[PDB]
Amino acid sequence: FNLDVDSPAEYSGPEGSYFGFAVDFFVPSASSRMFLLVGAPKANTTQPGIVEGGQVLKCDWSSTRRCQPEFDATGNRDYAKDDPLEFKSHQWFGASVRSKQDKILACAPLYHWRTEMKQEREPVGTCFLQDGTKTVEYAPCRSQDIDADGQGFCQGGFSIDFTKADRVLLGGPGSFYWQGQLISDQVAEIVSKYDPNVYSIKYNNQLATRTAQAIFDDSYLGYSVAVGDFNGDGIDDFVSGVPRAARTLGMVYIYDGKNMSSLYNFTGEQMAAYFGFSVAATDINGDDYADVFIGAPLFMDRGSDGKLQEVGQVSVSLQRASGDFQTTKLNGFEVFARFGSAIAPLGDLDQDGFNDIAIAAPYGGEDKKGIVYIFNGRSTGLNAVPSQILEGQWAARSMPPSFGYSMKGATDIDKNGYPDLIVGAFGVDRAILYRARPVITVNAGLECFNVRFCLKADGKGVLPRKLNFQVELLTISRGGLMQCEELIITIFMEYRLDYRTAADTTGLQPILNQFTPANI
Amino acid sequence: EARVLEDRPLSDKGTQVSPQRIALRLRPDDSKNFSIQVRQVEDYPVDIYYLMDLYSMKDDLWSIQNLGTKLATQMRKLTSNLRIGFGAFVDKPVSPYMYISPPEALENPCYDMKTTCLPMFGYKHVLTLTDQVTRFNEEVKKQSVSRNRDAPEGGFDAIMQATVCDEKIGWRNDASHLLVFTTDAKTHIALDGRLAGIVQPNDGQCHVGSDNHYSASTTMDYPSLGLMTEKLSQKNINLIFAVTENVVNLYQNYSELIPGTTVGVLSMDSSNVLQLIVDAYGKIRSKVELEVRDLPEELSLSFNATCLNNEVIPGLKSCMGLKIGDTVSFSIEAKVRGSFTIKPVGFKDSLIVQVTFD
């Protein structure tokens, strides 16, 4: 409820460049700034002889609001004269963009190369890692296991997610006849074992899934990924979505972060509902475990009378100590809205003590401009009803606006004590930023005719020292005791806070709590 | 009250619903009863659009060489206006589905087994619905096959484009529409397109230009089971899954999500498609179910089907047990608590209920 709507930060880009397909924050542990990593997988770079390679852009937050991108500045490499090795054109560089400290992992899933043995084209997939002044290329699927039987059509880098111990996890849903694969390698191994002359690098700590039987064919394992603890130790585990899991029902696999064994499995309910289009692991009830959030944007809910209407569905599973899960589903609101498309955790949006989540419908609302829903969790699960509605503001141009398809939260850019949210609308190639306004809680009073009206307030994070209220019966310090006055059937009073004076330099107007009343 | 305001008799041989435009008028917080009478007219015109999938189905092309004549000889015994159409599909001619590796595989995708093949195409409309059954034969002889790397194919794109394109396919406004769907592989359902770089959702508009190809194959994603269902009922199209024995159970579960669909066990070479389609006619017109458009939000209607022999089935809106054509009736209630159309699935005739609150 605390997200600002009046004055959001906007971020444009090249026309039709899919600016906003991937959005992520850039917090460095080397400076005192916080930038915005936004990917444009259909932009045109200055690489000679490459068309629509794509790029990742850094966008300033406290500046003239400019945006500037250099993971690579070279054309196709040559394997022997008169024939090239790789083809980075239309490679979709920017489909995935992650960050952790000074690390930027940007991947191009539709990257093709000529395997050394034959003369062919295989979407193995490519990635790039930047730890500061050292940028390296990471292509785990560009190995000698070739063709669709191996990792030739791997599409590596389709989905990525960092690990708390720097064990980046890669999902390529086309490896081994599209059964899917997941690959995890250390950041230390990636930078250390990097050459511009060795195409296939075996590393040493390679955690990769192996081929299965033909029953699990065309399952697309690696569509989405997430990191979270599910075995009990300190090592994060890999959660991946398998939308076509052998009956198109959809399954979600949770592996291990150490030896990568099958820990837990979920299964879908409706066929062709894409149970596993997007996953997100966080804590929604503050039990120090990790919950799971599987999106099914194509789920067809049975309507009131007898009809089936596609509204989408997100499954909420709560981890328990014994390992079992408590599952609860919340269905979409609009029809053909793709609710359950980008589930982005937000952390403590209002600092109530429990983390909150954001679920977006990219093609629902007014003129199908996209709407982002905000949910706040309690120590019972999470609230079924939404806490805030966010709406697009740019009408579709040729392409649907697709507002909310890409999102990223749980990061404070203002350093104001509350995290923030970034929303990417690549159809209208726009990126937006919403700042969580500070939250105040007020406890009221009002205990010949003798009446005495009391009030006090407090909050978290950056907040002005004194708040000017306005009370009428028919200056209070933030953190002080009960201040009031006494002056000499129903008696009515209200407190209307003066937001304008309680603002800050940019303005960031504070907001009152949700359950608190104002009339007594 | 409920004024009939319009009523014509149930036609004898090829009007199906008896009351055409009722005149509801409700005082707030009340409910009255309607009337309906379905009539599956015998010898109603039929149009069959044979949507075929062509490399493992190259023997099917030879085994259905003379199909229009065999169709006519065994379909005019139950109808007098039969039209046949032909359309084909393989998959989208985009990167992670087609053989672009050898420089000569764009023109000849089968340059691995030492044969010839057509370049892969998304959807091809070949023959419009014509009453001449010999044109089906002479156009199906000029068909060859292509090859796709993946196992699933672009079947749903073909079904969608056949449904929404109306001038190109020539579905009659007054006819019994049959759509055949023959394949031996799985299907690339909606959202199976960002692997190919396609993230623009299907709009439903039909893009088969004058070149008879789906021009938005490499630009738009596959349709879903909701967009297809929304358009298969708008144009009153019946879909038959003439699939093989390894995909029957898969396509049966898709079938039990869309109203008006059935499956058939298509042989290895499509050597029993005539009997399959004939039996699919007696399985499509043997079920009568009612569906509603534009129902007011402040209205709730119940459905008491009265079928077979004076039954009182309390709640069902559909009836089973019809052979060719029968006169069945469903009573209706409608509560207001303070134009909506009733029509059967697969037909254009409807009871346009006029509601005026007083």
Side-chain angles (χ1 to χ4, degrees), chain A residues 174-197:
Chain A
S175 305
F176 317 136
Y177 266 123
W178 289 274
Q179 298 181 3
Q181 201 187 28
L182 295 176
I183 270 176
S184 206
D185 291 325
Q186 286 151 223
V187 194
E189 230 148 74
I190 286 160
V191 194
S192 77
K193 300 204 89 273
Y194 164 75
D195 321 63
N197 330 308

Side-chain angles (χ1 to χ4, degrees), chain A residues 397-475:
Chain A
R397 166 213 49 82
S398 79
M399 188 156 15
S402 205
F403 172 94
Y405 196 58
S406 86
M407 263 160 22
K408 191 68 204 34
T411 288
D412 189 344
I413 193 150
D414 324 284
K415 306 194 278 240
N416 80 298
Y418 301 70
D420 311 286
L421 185 55
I422 186 182
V423 179
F426 56 89
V428 299
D429 64 12
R430 249 72 157 159
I432 220 173
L433 169 88
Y434 291 113
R435 295 143 69 169
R437 284 154 64 202
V439 182
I440 320 186
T441 167
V442 244
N443 299 36
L446 172 65
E447 91 292 38
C448 249
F449 228 85
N450 220 10
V451 299
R452 187 237 194 83
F453 58 105
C454 295
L455 188 80
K456 91 214 163 151
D458 230 10
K460 296 215 209 133
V462 155
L463 224 27
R465 49 263 304 274
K466 321 205 93 56
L467 325 159
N468 305 15
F469 285 65
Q470 202 107 21
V471 56
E472 210 22 70
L473 264 158
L474 262 307
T475 315

Side-chain angles (χ1 to χ4, degrees), chain B residues 83-266:
Chain B
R83 286 216 220 223
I84 324 293
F86 197 79
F89 64 91
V90 202
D91 211 337
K92 347 205 88 187
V94 80
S95 162
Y97 305 116
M98 74 163 333
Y99 291 77
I100 49 56
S101 302
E104 301 102 34
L106 311 95
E107 335 277 357
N108 198 358
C110 298
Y111 175 43
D112 183 358
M113 172 268 195
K114 254 49 206 190
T115 182
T116 70
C117 287
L118 259 167
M120 179 132 79
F121 52 92
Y123 168 67
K124 191 159 41 167
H125 168 63
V126 200
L127 172 71
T128 316
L129 278 164
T130 82
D131 40 330
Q132 275 80 45
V133 283
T134 31
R135 282 216 59 118
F136 198 71
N137 295 35
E138 58 147 6
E139 288 250 347
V140 99
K141 266 162 18 203
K142 283 194 292 278
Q143 305 292 138
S144 56
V145 303
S146 213
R147 195 167 66 155
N148 53 276
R149 207 153 20 201
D150 40 311
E153 287 181 85
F156 285 4
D157 275 45
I159 301 177
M160 179 82 285
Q161 282 284 280
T163 273
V164 289
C165 268
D166 258 318
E167 213 31 71
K168 221 96 200 49
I169 320 296
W171 298 103
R172 279 184 286 202
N173 202 22
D174 40 317
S176 172
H177 306 118
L178 263 41
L179 190 51
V180 112
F181 183 65
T182 143
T183 167
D184 72 349
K186 339 158 160 77
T187 168
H188 276 301
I189 77 248
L191 262 42
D192 281 310
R194 38 200 317 260
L195 268 73
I198 308 160
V199 275
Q200 163 170 320
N202 232 28
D203 46 8
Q205 333 320 345
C206 117
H207 309 279
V208 178
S210 129
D211 42 68
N212 285 359
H213 286 21
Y214 177 26
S215 80
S217 240
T218 64
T219 314
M220 215 149 46
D221 196 42
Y222 305 86
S224 22
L225 272 80
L227 198 48
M228 272 156 58
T229 299
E230 189 243 315
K231 261 72 156 45
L232 258 66
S233 60
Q234 164 175 359
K235 323 260 188 198
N236 310 282
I237 309 233
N238 291 75
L239 187 61
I240 315 158
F241 291 129
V243 289
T244 345
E245 245 277 350
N246 43 295
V247 272
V248 40
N249 289 306
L250 169 84
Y251 282 98
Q252 282 213 138
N253 281 29
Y254 300 131
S255 114
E256 284 259 314
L257 289 206
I258 317 189
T261 41
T262 52
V263 309
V265 197
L266 188 99

Side-chain angles (χ1 to χ4, degrees), chain A residues 336-357:
Chain A
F336 298 130
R338 312 269 225 249
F339 183 76
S341 289
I343 327 173
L346 291 153
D348 231 344
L349 202 50
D350 44 354
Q351 316 261 308
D352 46 345
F354 298 82
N355 283 14
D356 320 308
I357 225 181

